[model samples]
Every structure is written in structure tokens, then in C-alpha cells.
Target: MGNVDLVFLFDGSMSLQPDEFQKILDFMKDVMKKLSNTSYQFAAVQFSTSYKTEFDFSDYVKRKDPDALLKHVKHMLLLTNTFGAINYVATEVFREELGARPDATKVLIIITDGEATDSGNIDAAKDIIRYIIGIGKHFQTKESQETLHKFASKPASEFVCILDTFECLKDLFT
Candidate 1:
């Protein structure tokens, strides 16, 4: 996983209860533990009706501390503008300033709890590998599942993971 860049696109919609949101943050921390600071870089974009960069890869490279990243993720504001957030990360966040490397493996992990209100077309470079994870009751519906499938990279089974509750999210990393 050397030279890998991971961007977590998190849903910060108001629909998520505070406890549920904390679970998501914990899930992120778990994922970070599995990565090597020297081999992988991290960035995060939290979205609700709008989006905010909790921290970019540059910040990660600078601090090299998982606790700080957790702190940033915990403070994000919530909405469900999933489509806009996707586009924003593809276009803006995945740049030099954000610690995006031209020769690295770019993986986008999108975690959402609800359906997107807008179309989910991402026009980023061809190198991005997208994985979509939906958590909670809202994402268990057929429509929501289909939307997540549509947003994921090819071979949906390999790139998509939907859990009925956030409690099961830790299983993904395991």
C-alpha cells in the first residue's frame, strides 16, 4: 500500500443522531489503525447540505497523528448533499495542496446513511477507486441500496458494503 492516498467522504447529514455520528468517527479511527503513516496518506470530506474538509492529506502528513484526525472528524457539521460532496472531492480536494499525488493509488471511501437528493456523477480522473458504504435503517431500502451501487466503482459487490446499523461497521475493517 505504499504511495496510497485514501479519502473518506463522510455523510454529516442531520438525520444521523449524535450517537450514530460518534460510531462513524470510531469506525474511521479503526480504519486508520490499519494503515501505515509512512505508506499511506489520509484526507476527509464531510458532507450534509454542504461539505467541509475535515482535514486533507497534507494535514495528515504534517501531524501524522490519528488522534488529531479523529478530533477533526468529530467536529464536522452535518447535511446530505452527497452528490455535491463527491464532485467537490473529485475536483478540488484531490489536488496537490490536499496531498494528492499524481503517481499514487487513490481510493475514495464514501460512508452515508441516507439517499442522495441529487444525481451522483463524479467527473474525476480515471484513477480513483470508489467504495461506498451505507449504514443504518435509511440505507437498507432498495432505492438507497441501488443508489449506493450506482455510486460505487465497478463490481459493486467488491466495492459496496451496506450495514443495517453503524454497530456493524467495524466488521468491515476486520
Candidate 2:
């Protein structure tokens, strides 16, 4: 845990209902509670058609406030551009100045309720291992399933979690 850096990429598309969106934030807070700030660092990016960096890893490492980070995640506007979000994470968000550490295990978790609008190269960065979590029935389709598999790190079973509802997130992570 001390050598791990976690970056969460959220789908803020209009397709997510307000309640459902809030549940996702709650899920993140739950994860935060279990991780020690001394050992783990966190960052988040929310996206719909465009993306916003709600908080970067340095924000937490400097302020040491998980609540503030959660608040930002809670307030992000909803919409979806899965491809753009991924690309941004790969190109910008993972940079050392932003939050990434050269020696740490880089893990990118993508939580999305919709399919990607454009093609994204998840393999562009070889060091960042990706996990794609698909939420709701909307992601049950063959196409959506394929996309999740395509973007996730190889040996998909370990990196992909397809949940029927947000409530199951805690269990999956645990």
C-alpha cells in the first residue's frame, strides 16, 4: 500500500441519475476510509463530454484531507466522454508533477456507466495498469463488455468488475 498510487477516472455523463451518481461518490469515500494517507495517495478525474481533474495526488499528499477530495468528487457535473478521460489520464494526469510517482505501482481505475464514444489507447502507457469497472445494466451489452475488456489490462478477470448496481462496489473492492 505504501508504494501504490491510485487514480480514479469517473464517467460523469448525463446518463447517470443524480442518486446513482452520488452512490458512486459514496463508494469512493468508503475506499478512502480504508486506506492510510501515509501509505497511499489518491487522485480523481471526472468526465462527461469533457473532463475535470477534481483532485490530484499532490492535493491529498499536501493537504492530507480525504473529505475535501470526496467533496470535490461529489460536486462534479455529470456527463460522459470515456475516451477523452482515458487519454487525458494517460497523457497528463499521470505525470510526476501532477501526482504520479516513478517508483510506485500505478493503478488506474475507470468507473463508467456508458460505452466509449471514441477509440482510446489504453496500452499507450505500459507502466500504468488499468482496471475498468462497468456499472448498471447499460453495460451488460456485448459491445460495452468488449470495450471494457479492450481497455483494461490483460488478464481481464482481475482488472474488470461489472456490477449490476453501485452498492456492490464495496464488496468488490473488499
Candidate 3:
């Protein structure tokens, strides 16, 4: 609960039209502005047809820099044509950067307007978790039913949280 790091996995794809894309941007800005006084740090990544690290967790994990984070978010454009944002987290970013930070509690926050079109047997997610556990640590996984089923075949909760879009996340602010 304490030593927590907030990782935002943003879905940057064609499904999110201009208006929807604006909402995503607003959401990111709102989250950053609202959660300013906490010890929490913010890291962000965008996924569409491919995956890449937009912001490192380490950059904002220690100090709260909303402007820097917003700058990173602003410069990033949606590149992933296919909607497999979750797969991107499991394979590309998490395994490389976040997994190395064992001391910090990893909390993933994902926002997607549609389904994971390119997800299949997310071996990458499992490997990322195993890597964390190997170092005697834990990481939280969050997604919607549309996306979670791609990775969670069973009804286990080792590291999973699924919820509806606005309902689940909107309450967090209140």
C-alpha cells in the first residue's frame, strides 16, 4: 500500500476517435492534477499496433512532476493499430524497466476504449510476474473483462483487477 508506483497504460489506437482521444488526454491530465500531493509516482506507456516506453516509472516514482509527465504524454501519439495494449505491458515495457525496480510497489492502471484485438496467451505477463516474484516482490495487474480473459484463463487473483471503464476509475477520485 505504501511505496506504491502508478503506471498508466494508455490505449492509443484508431478505435479512440478524436473526441475519445481527447477524453483520454483529459483523463491523464485529471489524474495527474488531482493526485498531486501524494508520495506516488507516475509512469506512462501507450500501446496500439506496437509498444514503447513513453515515460519511465523511475522518473516520477520519487518526486511528483506533473508538467514533465504531461509533456511526455502530449508528445506521444497513438501508434498501435491493433488494440493489444495489455500484451505490450507484459512483453515490452514491464519486463525491461519496471521489473527491475523491486523495492517499489507496482500498480498498473490501464484505460482502453475497446478489446485487445491482438492478444493471445500472454506468456509475457506471466514471465513479467515471475521475474518480480523471483526477486521476492509483487505487482498489481488491472484490466477489463474484455482484456483480462486474454491473459487470465482461470479464476485466480494472484495479480489481477478487472472493471468497467468510467465506473471503476471514476470512483477512485471521489
Candidate 4:
């Protein structure tokens, strides 16, 4: 089979403490190790109040070397918000990288602590067309579900999985 491209869209907001950040990273590492033999590739974006492509999937997979992948993730900066960051992902990074690659199994795994504070939050859904999954708080209220629903292209089961905290990941991991 062809390779599966995994994109980790992490939350670097102030809400995530140093220890929790490391735990999340550690979980990611373990997850990667488990998928070692699969034809898999990885990239990462760190979003706090804003977003940035800390590690592009192209950089890691093009090299076909694990050392480089770890180094890239290790040296990435952790930001503090998700607004500007998500905008950049939708308008810039995703368009330039992820959206361009349709053959690969593109997966976006977003980890956030809460809802986005920035305006124009719905703009992110306009640009992303791939299979995306979110693992974070359901900060969206009943009335706001419509706005958030547009952010997801596929059915709720296919593209979204909201969680209260990282602790919820334990079941998924097992």
C-alpha cells in the first residue's frame, strides 16, 4: 500500500503546561514508534493563539530518514494561540502542502485545550478538503455547532472526534 501522511496540529497555548506538553509529545513519539513499519510519513504544526508550520511533512518524508524527522519536531517552536495559526494553516500552509497532495492518506490530528478566541475562525474549513480529525475540548456550544460544523467537510464520524482532555486518548491508544 501507499504511505499514510500524518499531520499533527498541536496546541501550544498557555493552557498547556510544560509537563503536559512533554506528555503530549511523548504520546506522539510512542504513536510514531507503533507505526514504524507502516508506509507512514509525519509533519507537525504548532498552534497557540495562532498557527505555524513548525515541521512540514515534506521535510521528513522526502528525506526517508528518522533522525531528521525527530530533529525537526524537537527544534520546533511552541506557540500560544490557535487563531492566526489556524488561519495560516487554511490560507497558507494547507493550501501549499497538504491540499496539493491528494493521493496520500492525509490525516490532520489537532490537539487543543479550548475554543478559538480569534475572529474568522470558520475560514479554516474553506481551504481544507482532506480527512481531518480533532482531539480536544468541545468548546463549541449548541448554538455555535453550525459554525463549527462547516469546519468539517465529512460526516462527524469521518473527520471529527472531540475530546475533553488528553486523558481521553488513553482509550484510543489502547
Candidate 5:
């Protein structure tokens, strides 16, 4: 609601269809354009078995063509490690030196089509708000929905958005 420190926790796992991840990138670009003039600093982290900060909040301050970042993000093509990735975003990406504003509203939008393949060993701080953009028909299941709900912030209706396909993302936030 206020100045936002928004981070996209993208799943770059093998479960995603080849060249299919592009749809999410296109969708992401639309959001950046819509909020281009606002007090928004966007960052994206691609997560699979490992995690990669495609761009940090500081890049928003210094990049000449920030929109091109989506094209440069490499696909990790492994398993989904949602737990560790969350901790990584909370610790590394949200650091003071990384341009995370202490006063800014922290929002983590997790885009994942699959479930977490690893254990939840680390605990992230609760200061930030999280939204999960769960993809695929699998999420419709009660068990999967419950699992996804755990990753999101309280009041599931506001934070958990499940789409059957990446194509639905645009319509969802439109």
C-alpha cells in the first residue's frame, strides 16, 4: 500500500514447460509498466534447487533498462526448493545494503507451479507480507491448497492466488 519493496520469488524448475516461463516474464513486465511512475522498486529471484537473485532492489535505482532483466534471467531447471528460497529472500535479498528500505512495505510474490521438494528447516522473519501465485491444476486439490496457504500471509483470500496457467495471471490482476 505504501512505498513497496516488491520481490518476485520465481520458480525456475524443471516442472515449468520449456519457453513457457516467458509468459510470467511478459506478465511481470506489464505490472512494472503499470506502476512505472509509482514509488515501486522491483526485484526478482529465480529459485529451483538453488536460488539466484535475478535482480535486487538496488538495480531498480541504477539500471538503465530494467525491463530487460526478465530476458536475462536464466532458467535453473531443477527441483523446487521453496523453503530455502524464502529464507534466502528474507536474509540476502532484503538486506540494508541490498537497497531494502526499512520503512517500505515488503511484499514477496511467490510464483510456483509445483510443491516444495525440500524440508522447511529455516524460519524467515515475519515482518514482510507474502503472496503466492500458485500455478497449475494441482493446486486445486485440498491438500495442495493447504500447503500453499502455509506459504502465504494471513487471510488466505488476499494473499493466495491460484491460476491454472500463466496466461491467467494478466486477467487475475487486471
Candidate 6:
């Protein structure tokens, strides 16, 4: 494949268990293993009440190692500011001037537990192929389901995955 920017926007809220975060890291590593051949630039942005770009594209551009990608990440345990972080990544972090490549395919992988608490407004998502995965028991109701699905790109089936638990998360990426 050609150049592609993969940005992982994960929920770092209080809802996510400590062990679950480890599993998320494992799942990410598994995906990287499966896609080892591609020259994909990786970056991560973790969010809750706040957000942190754990590793930027430039960081990966320098090291490109599994360890470095997730070394400094510590969950920002507070609130589930999912939509806030999503809009930020879609508009700010993925911008060409910041880190995203203009000609490269931009892929956004958002792994969240449930609904967004702060704001529901999610408008800025351009030139991004979003693969939204809602794992755990938090998002079970029809309305909550719709909210999670809303974050995915068009053709909901292709872009969204509702696993209902993190135990099966590794399978989807692999």
C-alpha cells in the first residue's frame, strides 16, 4: 500500500478498566503486526475529559517501534469527552500542516466504551476513513447504539463494530 496515516483515538475515561487499556494496547499491537508490511504512519490520541496526542506521526516517523507508540500513554481518567476529541483529531491532528499527509489515505480508528457525556456535536470529519468500535456493556440501548454508529463513516456496517466486550477486540483487528 501507499502512504497512509493511522490515528487511533481511544477512550481514556474512567469507564475503561486498567486491564482493558492493556488489552487495547495489545489489540493495537496485533493490528500493527498484521500490517507490518505497509508503510503506514501511526499516531495516537487518548481522550476523556481532556485529550493527549500520546504519539504523533512525527514520533513514529522517527522510531516506528511498538514500544514508543504507547510508552507515554496514561489514561486521562475523568469524563468521556469522545466527541470533543473526535472533532479535534478530525480537524486538528489530522491536518496536513500538523501531521497528516495530503496524498496519503487518512484512517481514523476510534475505540470507545459508550456514549459521550459533554457534547454531542461531531461535524468535522473530512478525508478520514473512520473505523469506530464500541466495546463493553455501556452502549447497549438503541439510542446509545445510534450514537456510536453515528461516529463511523458512511455504510455503517463497514465502518463500525459493536463488540459489546473488549475480550473480542483483538479478533476484529487481526
Question: What TM-score, to 2 decimals, does candidate 2 have?
Answer: 0.81
lDDT tens readout by residue for model 6, 1-174: 578888888888887789777777776665666666566777888888888888777776777686657877786779988888888897768866566788888888898875788766667775588788776665666466676676778876567665444332343344
- Please give each candidate's TM-score: 0.83, 0.81, 0.61, 0.61, 0.85, 0.83
Clash number by candidate, in order: 7, 8, 3, 11, 0, 0
> Which ten contiguous residues of candidate 5 have the minimum total lDDT?
164-173
- Estimate, for each residue in 73-159, the C-alpha lDDT of model 2 and write its tens digit: 643455466766877887878789986788888777788764666665555555778777776676656565676776678877666
RMSD of 3: 8.5
Output the number of the lDDT-best candidate: 5
lDDT of each: 0.73, 0.71, 0.50, 0.53, 0.76, 0.74
On TM-score, the stronger of 3 and 4 is 3
Once fitted onto the true fold, the runs of candidate 2 whose alpha carbons sit more than 4 angstroms away are: 73-79, 139-144, 163-174
For residues 45-124, write the lDDT of model 5, one tens digit per residue.
Answer: 99999999998888876772556777678778999999899899999898878888888888888887648888874457
Best-to-worst ranking by TM-score: 5, 6, 1, 2, 3, 4
Which candidate number maximizes TM-score? 5
User: What 10-residue stretch in candidate 1 is worst by lDDT?
Assistant: 163-172
Native-to-model Cα distance after best TM-score fit, residue 156 in candidate 2, in Å: 0.8
Sorted by lDDT, highest first, which candidate order results? Answer: 5, 6, 1, 2, 4, 3
RMSD of 1: 3.4
Model 3, residue 131: distance off in Å is 21
Model 3 scores a TM of: 0.61
Q: Which residue window of length 10 is worst by lDDT in model 4?
A: 164-173
Runs of candidate 1 with Cα error greater than 4 angstroms are 72-78, 138-144, 163-174
Model 5 gets an lDDT of: 0.76
lDDT string for model 4 (45-120, tens) is 7776446576666765565444445554442344444556555665555443543355655455655553555655
